[PDB]
Design a protein around this ligand. Structure first.
Ligand SMILES: Nc1nc2c(ncn2[C@@H]2O[C@H](COP(=O)(O)OP(=O)(O)O)[C@@H](O)[C@H]2O)c(=O)[nH]1
Ligand SMILES: Nc1nc2c(ncn2[C@@H]2O[C@H](COP(=O)(O)OP(=O)(O)O)[C@@H](O)[C@H]2O)c(=O)[nH]1
Ligand SMILES: O=P(O)(O)OC[C@H]1C[C@H](N[C@H]2C=C(CO)[C@@H](O)[C@H](O)[C@H]2O)[C@H](O)[C@@H](O)[C@@H]1O
Ligand SMILES: O=P(O)(O)OC[C@H]1C[C@H](N[C@H]2C=C(CO)[C@@H](O)[C@H](O)[C@H]2O)[C@H](O)[C@@H](O)[C@@H]1O
Ligand SMILES: [Cl-]
Ligand SMILES: [Cl-]
Lengths: 470, 472
């Protein structure tokens, strides 16, 4: 019976009042990673450590600082109250202003970025935030004789080294949900950050990414920057200062637990509907999707076709995100002016059910990200689509390593190639689409949240034996 | 006695009239690669094929289509054959090869999030590029038709397509392709449209030897090959590619400077007198990073100790018609204007003119040299400047110049994107005492001195000879 300790920046919690009693209710969101882990047979018990980012979180933390047991089987939820100034700066450190641009290829080098004092301060703040997490995690696991640590996502990259210092023999997995960039791009970052982040990650027993390309890039970055590290590209390992680290690819597609926005159905009725969906993040590439649709339309055959750009607002305070929405609006305005009024609409709202409705209704799905750690939407959409919609998928999504063969895989920067794919996908007959969609669904279906959790547990257990042995 | 055939986009030629007779003169520029090659002991004779890009070049080609026997000292003659491309094709290819396309691709100018977005303009550019490549191959083969065992040396990126076409006609010839600019990471290389990112690799790989100035570029190339050609096999240790029966060797052959390498630009000396002089020099190309140099200088000044210090931004105008170059000059001007407004009038000057002698004078006069490129294929300036500097100037060198693989230890190596690190290096370099600078400069000069044009040519000939045996 392993005692599991899960850490991630955000723990999904729902705060409300009972409709009958009016009593205040805090209750964990269904299908959460912690909930799934709670279920593997091996697991005796689990605690979950995350950041308090809301007033409610804050209150709950003060209220139960050691933590609160949450019934589901039970998982102990411990929220961290960071210093507010530090927490916010770290949030800006993790945004397209810094680390998001670094792992998601947002910088052109010729003009950006130019690191100043702000970068040094952001890094200092990042160390303090990392220390909070490590301390909360260790404290939470103090009684445990054999704690298993699962650290999730980029914000926590510094945590493994600090865990390892206090717990030299613990299984530590770090899972990164976003890409890792080429060695030349990774080293854009200031010296203390580009080496310092590698110092924090490498003491993990296992580092996981969604895609092989990300493991390869990671290993090249290590090789490039730490002259004392030894990488093995075949074995996927790093040996560094007596640290042996295993890199693993553990793809995720979707959670088995997965109506239209106002006026969309009637607006779409009588037309084929091209759907592009993603957060208001420049990587999602909706501007280029729209320009590509416009080029396809010029080719003809698209007269009864409409396009919906479905966006979920996120991080709009970040200039790059705001500017992306501005570029999307511009391209959509210009598409209408040329093609005809109301050919293209944006529907920008945070309602996951609406988006799923868009997925079902689509006659063509476009997930053409400039880059993407994985992209779960491209697994969800074909699985719920009832129209035998083709999928246009960018070759730079991690998901392309699993589904690329089953989709129209495109260079997300080539408007011509993407236009041609849109024309071909729409020209394709019902029987051909129907058969391709069934192949597509079968390729997507196995990659479930649960298999992903199992992959982590097994891969960790196995890497722990190896590390223990060498 | 090997018969050598050299190809490059441009062949440095001087057109003028004899000052005594008034007769028209065309003579090869001294210190040229072709001139150097002709001097090697192995070489029996050499021809040089290049593009006509001037009206003079054009008239010369029409008058001597087969070629022209240009004269060298020591009674060594190099045959020079200029190609008259179709003008429309030639100009578009110039645009393809401009930051508008291929330059941004090998020199990391694209943010991915907003640029680039390839259109029909790229497809046409590629078609034009095939036609330009076919002209070169035809001129080169024709020029070598009589030769029993022609040795082909193909220089620079514009000719990347040439080796495959040479190999088709001449399956057993030694073919070297030397690329003078960086090769980008696999993920960045594959930004380019499918027919370009694979088609360029198809063009290069049949060469016997592919050379770059730096190991990083060879590694990136190999990763690109591995990423895009599932039928290729790479060997990172051996530095080789095997692809469709083609065995290709990658080599790093660093170049520093030509031993053949004055006075300051008007008013620079008096303006600089009484002050320590920070010098940054490069073409008006965004990779040269002068904007960031200036911002870093400003941050250094805020720290104090720089009160008697001035900065000169020496630029050589080039490709100003390309928007990214014009915009770079615009960002530089802005930063220089803002530096003056904050630090004091005339603290920083730009001197932007095409006069190599002026730049060399700037190198001699500098109390601190800054070559902080965002990326560079090599950067010869960083080798030339220390070698002529009389002031024991420190050198701030970007870790992303190919030259950093030879000189990085002997310079203040910096991340070109970190204004803070670069400001600190400027303060430290200027704070350093005369004895420390003197000793560092002598070690710097010793590290730079061996990397001559001639050694580089010899490296190509030997490396090719050796790779030809292996491939054979
Ligand atoms: N909260 C919210 N989630 C959404 C909305 N639309 C889609 N989603 C989903 O959020 C996830 C998006 O993840 P993914 O495609 O991997 O891209 P990511 O945003 O970079 O992590 C998927 O599970 C989608 O179902 C929305 O409007 N609101
Ligand atoms: N024509 C010309 N050449 C210059 C001038 N200033 C410097 N140079 C030379 O041009 C070369 C610059 O090459 P390098 O630093 O390798 O950068 P590149 O411009 O990217 O190839 C050096 O040989 C310089 O000495 C100038 O004003 N005009
Ligand atoms: O909550 P935010 O506004 O900070 O951003 C939403 C998520 C985006 C990013 N999602 C990733 C996760 C996943 C799925 O786990 C991948 O499919 C995505 O490609 C990748 O962008 C990021 O990694 C997460 O930490 C963020 O919470
Ligand atoms: O075409 P131009 O003259 O506007 O550009 C000047 C040169 C810049 C570039 N010079 C390279 C040569 C060298 C040395 O030959 C490297 O040191 C530089 O880093 C690299 O930028 C390019 O490769 C050449 O083809 C160009 O002629
Ligand atoms: Cl890169
Ligand atoms: Cl990259």
């Amino acid at each position: 019976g392993s005692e599991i300790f899960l850490a991630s920046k955000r723990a999904a919690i729902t705060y409300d009042t009972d409709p009958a009693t009016g009593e205040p209710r805090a209750w964990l969101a269904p299908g959460g990673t912690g909930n799934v882990v709670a279920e593997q047979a091996g697991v005796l018990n689990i605690s979950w450590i995350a950041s308090a980012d809301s007033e409610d979180d804050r209150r709950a933390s003060a209220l139960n600082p050691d933590g609160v047991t949450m019934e589901l089987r039970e998982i102990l939820v411990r929220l961290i109250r960071h210093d507010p100034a530090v927490f916010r700066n770290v949030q800006n450190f993790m945004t397209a202003n810094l680390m998001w641009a670094a792992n998601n290829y947002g910088w052109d080098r010729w003009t950006q970025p130019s690191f100043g004092s702000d970068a040094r301060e952001g890094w200092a703040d990042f160390g303090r935030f990392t220390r909070d997490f490590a301390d909360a995690i260790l404290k939470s696991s103090a009684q445990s004789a054999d704690p298993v640590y699962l650290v999730h996502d980029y914000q926590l990259v510094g945590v493994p080294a600090l865990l390892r210092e206090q717990r030299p023999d613990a299984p530590i997995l770090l899972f990164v949900h976003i890409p890792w960039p080429s060695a030349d791009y990774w080293r854009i970052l200031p010296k203390e950050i580009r080496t310092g982040i590698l110092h924090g990650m490498l003491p993990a027993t296992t580092i996981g990414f969604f895609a092989d390309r990300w493991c390869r890039n990671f290993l090249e970055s290590v090789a490039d920057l730490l002259p004392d590290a030894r990488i093995d590209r075949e074995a996927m390992t790093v040996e560094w200062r007596g640290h042996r680290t295993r890199l693993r690819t553990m793809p995720l597609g979707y959670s088995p637990l997965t109506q239209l926005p106002e006026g969309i159905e009637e607006w779409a009725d009588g037309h084929r509907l091209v759907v592009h969906s993603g957060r208001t993040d420049p990587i999602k590439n909706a501007e280029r999707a729209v320009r590509a649709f416009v080029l396809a339309a010029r080719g003809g055959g698209l007269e009864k076709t409409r396009m919906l750009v479905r966006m979920n607002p996120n991080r709009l305070y970040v200039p790059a995100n705001a500017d992306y929405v501005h570029r999307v609006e511009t391209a959509v305005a210009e598409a209408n002016a040329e093609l005809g009024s109301d050919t293209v609409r944006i529907d920008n709202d945070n309602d996951v059910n609406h988006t799923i409705a868009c997925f079902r209704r689509a006659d063509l799905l476009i997930f053409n990200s400039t880059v993407d750690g994985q992209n779960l939407s491209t697994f969800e959409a074909p699985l719920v689509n009832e129209r035998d919609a083709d999928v246009i998928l960018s070759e730079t999504c991690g998901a392309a390593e699993v589904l690329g063969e089953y989709c129209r895989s495109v260079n997300p920067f080539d408007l011509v190639e993407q236009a041609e794919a849109i024309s071909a996908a729409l020209a394709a007959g019902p029987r051909q689409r129907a058969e391709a969609a069934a192949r597509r669904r079968d390729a997507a279906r196995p990659w479930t949240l649960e298999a992903w959790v199992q992959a982590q547990l097994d891969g960790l257990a196995a890497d722990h034996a190896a590390r223990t042995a060498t």
